[PDB]
C-alpha cells in the first residue's frame, strides 16, 4: 500500500495473507468470506505470461495477521488449501477481466477477535454504494512504493471510486463492466493506491444502512503504483457473485 497508514488491531479481521511455502514469502492478499472459503484475485494464482500457475499444495493461508513477517503465535491461524477455483472466463490473455478466484480450506477456521468474515454485496448494496465519490478501503502487506520499501504491519488506505469515463481515459487497456477503478485525481491532492503484494486483497465499504462491512472489490491491476493520472482497478465483486454462489453451493 502506497501513502497509507498502519492498520489498527482487528481493523480488518477478514484480511488473509496468501503465503508461498518455498521460498517462504508473501504472494498476495485475500479475504475471508466464511469459515472455509477465501476470496482472491485469479492472477494471484494463474498468470501464464510470467510462468505463474500455483497449485493448492504450493500455498498456505494465514489469517488474523497484523505483522507482515512475524509468526503471530496465539493469534494468527495458518490453513491448508483443499481446492482452488478460478473463474472459467478469467481473461489473463488481455485485460484480466473477471479476475477472481475462490479457495476452499481443508478445515474450517475458528473465528476470534482477529479473525472474522466480511460480507458480500447483494444487488441493492452495490447500487447504493458503488458510486463515484464514495470511498472504500484497501488493505495489504504489499510494497510501500512502486520502486525504492516494505511494511512491518498491515497497511490501510481509503480511496474514492472514480467515474467510469475517467477510468477509461486514464489507460489504453480495455475496461469492462466487471471492473471499477478508485483513487484520487491529480488535482485532489490526496494520494494512495495498492501496490505489488496487495493484489487479491479486499476493497471494502461500510454500509451506512446496516453498519456492516462489504467487500465490493478485489485488488486487480494498475499501471505502476500511486502514479498521477493513473488509478487502481478492482474486480467488481457483485458482478461476479453468481459465479461465487455457484461454486459455493456446488462444492461447499
Amino acid at each position: 500500500i502506497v501513502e497509507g497508514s498502519d492498520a489498527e488491531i482487528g481493523m480488518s479481521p477478514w484480511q488473509v495473507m496468501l503465503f508461498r511455502k518455498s521460498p517462504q514469502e508473501l504472494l498476495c492478499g485475500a479475504s475471508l468470506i466464511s469459515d472455509r472459503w477465501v476470496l482472491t484475485a485469479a492472477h494471484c494464482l494463474l498468470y501464464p505470461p510470467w510462468d505463474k500457475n500455483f497449485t493448492e499444495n504450493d500455498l498456505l493461508v494465514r489469517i488474523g495477521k497484523h505483522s507482515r513477517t512475524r509468526y503471530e503465535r496465539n493469534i494468527e491461524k495458518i490453513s491448508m488449501l483443499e481446492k482452488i477455483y478460478i473463474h472459467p472466463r478469467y481473461n489473463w490473455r488481455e485485460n484480466l477481466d473477471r479476475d477472481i478466484a475462490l479457495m476452499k480450506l481443508k478445515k474450517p477456521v475458528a473465528f476470534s477477535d482477529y479473525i472474522h468474515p466480511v460480507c458480500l454485496p447483494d444487488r441493492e448494496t452495490a447500487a447504493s454504494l458503488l458510486q463515484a465519490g464514495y470511498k472504500g478501503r484497501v488493505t495489504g502487506w504489499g510494497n510501500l512504493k512502486e520502486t525504492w520499501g516494505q511494511p512491518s504491519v498491515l497497511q490501510v488506505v481509503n480511496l474514492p471510486i472514480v467515474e467510469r469515463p475517467v477510468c477509461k481515459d486514464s489507460t489504453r487497456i480495455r475496461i469492462t463492466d466487471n471492473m471499477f477503478c478508485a483513487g484520487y485525481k491529480p488535482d485532489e491532492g490526496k494520494r494512495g493506491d495498492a501496490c505489488e503484494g496487495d493484489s487479491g486483497g479486499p476493497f471494502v465499504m461500510k454500509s451506512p444502512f446496516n453498519n456492516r462491512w462489504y467487500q465490493m472489490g478485489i485488488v486487480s491491476w494498475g499501471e505502476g503504483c500511486d502514479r498521477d493520472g493513473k488509478y487502481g482497478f478492482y474486480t467488481h465483486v457483485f458482478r461476479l457473485k453468481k459465479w461465487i454462489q455457484k461454486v459455493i453451493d456446488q462444492f461447499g
Partner: peptide, 26 residues
C-alpha cells in the same frame, strides 16, 4: 449473518480512526 461486524469495533460499538472518512463520502 454476523459477517462484516468486527469483534473489536462494531461488536463493541467502537469506531476505527478513519471510518468517518468513508461515511462522510456517502
Amino acid at each position: 449473518a454476523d459477517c462484516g461486524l468486527r469483534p473489536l469495533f462494531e461488536k463493541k460499538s467502537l469506531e476505527d480512526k478513519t471510518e468517518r472518512e468513508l461515511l462522510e463520502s456517502y
